[PDB]
Design an enzyme around this catalytic site. Structure first.
Site, PDB file in Angstrom:
ATOM      1  N   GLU A  14      32.280  24.215  47.179  1.00 55.25           N
ATOM      2  CA  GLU A  14      31.081  23.821  46.431  1.00 55.25           C
ATOM      3  C   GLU A  14      30.807  22.313  46.451  1.00 55.25           C
ATOM      4  O   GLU A  14      30.772  21.657  45.406  1.00 55.25           O
ATOM      5  CB  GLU A  14      31.158  24.350  44.997  1.00 55.25           C
ATOM      6  CG  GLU A  14      31.168  25.877  44.972  1.00 55.25           C
ATOM      7  CD  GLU A  14      30.940  26.487  43.609  1.00 55.25           C
ATOM      8  OE1 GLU A  14      30.849  25.724  42.605  1.00 55.25           O
ATOM      9  OE2 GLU A  14      30.874  27.748  43.542  1.00 55.25           O
ATOM     10  N   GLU A  38      33.086  33.249  47.378  1.00 54.77           N
ATOM     11  CA  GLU A  38      33.317  33.219  45.922  1.00 54.77           C
ATOM     12  C   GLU A  38      32.124  33.647  45.099  1.00 54.77           C
ATOM     13  O   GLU A  38      31.020  33.142  45.285  1.00 54.77           O
ATOM     14  CB  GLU A  38      33.735  31.827  45.458  1.00 54.77           C
ATOM     15  CG  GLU A  38      34.254  31.820  44.027  1.00 54.77           C
ATOM     16  CD  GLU A  38      34.342  30.430  43.438  1.00 54.77           C
ATOM     17  OE1 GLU A  38      34.915  29.546  44.093  1.00 54.77           O
ATOM     18  OE2 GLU A  38      33.865  30.246  42.292  1.00 54.77           O
TER      19      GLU A  38
END
Length: 390
Positions: A140, A229
């Protein structure tokens, strides 16, 4: 009542790489021996996961904490990918991002040192019997309030100028929401694209209209596509058995596979009160939703073109086992009414499907076989259910 669907076994889509979730033995407790078997075994009451995600610790003294679960996952037939949250602190500098001070990024003059850190982890795990399938540049990069930010151009520089030196498959960019601004520069640069092996993405708040990716279809030949994820539809404490809430998990997976052409779907923490495995070590309603795919759609199966939404609230996907041309169909009925689908599977010699069904009151219950009439399988889906046909 009488809706129709066709599964076309000759129209092959993406090869399935698998399903699984996260172990993080630094932030939370490691999976126990029992829990490793429940996650990666495929017996009765086991999830049949075939991908383990782990983190690459900034502190190399924590690396040995990954080994026991990683080894066991591989022993039980899973593959392992690793994602870092921060480089070692001596490669990091602070900066101000959109008015917010003290944010972290990788020093531009430490990109080579970072490569060495990633390779060291790869070498260390390999030395301990964990041959990593891939390693990521950053978890991320575009939601790094509490870790290390990379702009699209910083990610591109690394992929273009350094990533070729990583002794592993390279995964990037793992946008928290599959934001294409993080990956487009990689895809549009031939050297960066050559150094990419897996386009990784997360699905937090990702809507269906943003699951297709035309640039990846155009330029991504030979690269894998992984959803590495998520949790859905929330991470509420003790929510994993909520019904019909749990149906969102199956729907999200269906969407990943069919709308996004994803080859892998990886949850966040395997063991958590909102995850596929509860703290008591058993499978939650959310876990059973994952299991409808993971226990039956095995690595190497290939998704095939099939009527994705044959009637309102009904969602269908199909994968082919190329060893014998058998088919696995996963069918979600979110309607409060029962639904009947005539599923045409032209050219198949198969004439019988077994079926497992999950509702608010039963988990993967084996129900009566479907006997085909010629190449048409008439199936009935009870309200608010997921069925896997095999």
């Amino acid at each position: 009542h009488m809706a129709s669907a066709t599964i076309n076994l000759s129209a092959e889509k993406q090869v399935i790489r698998g399903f699984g979730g996260m172990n993080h033995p630094v932030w939370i407790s490691d999976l126990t021996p029992q829990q490793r078997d429940t996650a990666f075994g495929n017996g009765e009451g086991q999830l049949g996961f075939t991908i383990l995600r782990i983190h690459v610790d900034e502190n190399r003294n924590n690396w040995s904490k990954e080994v026991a679960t990683a080894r066991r996952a591989i022993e039980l037939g899973a593959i392992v990918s690793a994602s870092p949250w921060n480089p070692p602190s001596n490669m990091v500098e602070t900066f101000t991002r959109n008015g917010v001070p003290n944010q972290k990024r990788l020093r531009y003059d430490k990109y080579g040192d970072y490569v060495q850190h990633l390779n060291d982890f790869v070498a260390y795990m390999k030395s301990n019997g964990v041959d990593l399938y891939a390693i990521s540049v950053q978890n991320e990069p575009d939601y790094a309030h509490e870790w290390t930010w990379w702009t699209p151009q910083e990610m591109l520089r690394f992929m273009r100028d350094y990533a070729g030196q990583i002794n592993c498959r390279v995964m990037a960019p793992e946008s928290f929401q599959y934001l294409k601004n993080m990956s487009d520069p990689i895809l549009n640069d031939p050297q960066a694209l050559a150094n990419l092996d897996i386009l990784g993405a997360h699905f937090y708040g990702t809507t269906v209209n943003n699951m297709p990716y035309p640039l990846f279809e155009q330029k991504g030949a030979g690269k894998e596509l992984w959803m590495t994820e998520v949790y859905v539809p929330n991470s509420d404490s003790n929510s994993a058995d909520r019904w019909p809430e749990a149906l969102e998990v199956a729907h999200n997976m269906h969407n990943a596979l069919v709308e996004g052409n994803f080859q892998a779907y990886v949850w966040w923490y395997i063991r958590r009160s909102y995850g596929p495995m509860k703290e008591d070590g058993t499978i939650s309603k959310r876990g059973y939703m994952m299991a409808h795919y993971s226990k039956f759609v095995r690595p190497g199966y290939v998704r095939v073109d099939a009527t994705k939404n044959p009637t309102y609230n009904v969602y269908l996907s199909a994968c082919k086992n190329k060893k014998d041309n058998s088919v696995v169909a996963v069918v979600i009925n979110k309607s409060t009414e029962a639904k009947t689908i005539n599923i045409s599977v032209p050219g198949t010699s198969i004439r019988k499907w077994e079926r497992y069904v999950t509702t608010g009151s039963k988990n993967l219950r084996k129900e009566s076989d479907i006997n085909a009439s010629g190449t048409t399988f008439q199936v009935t889906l009870e309200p608010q259910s997921v069925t896997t046909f095999v």
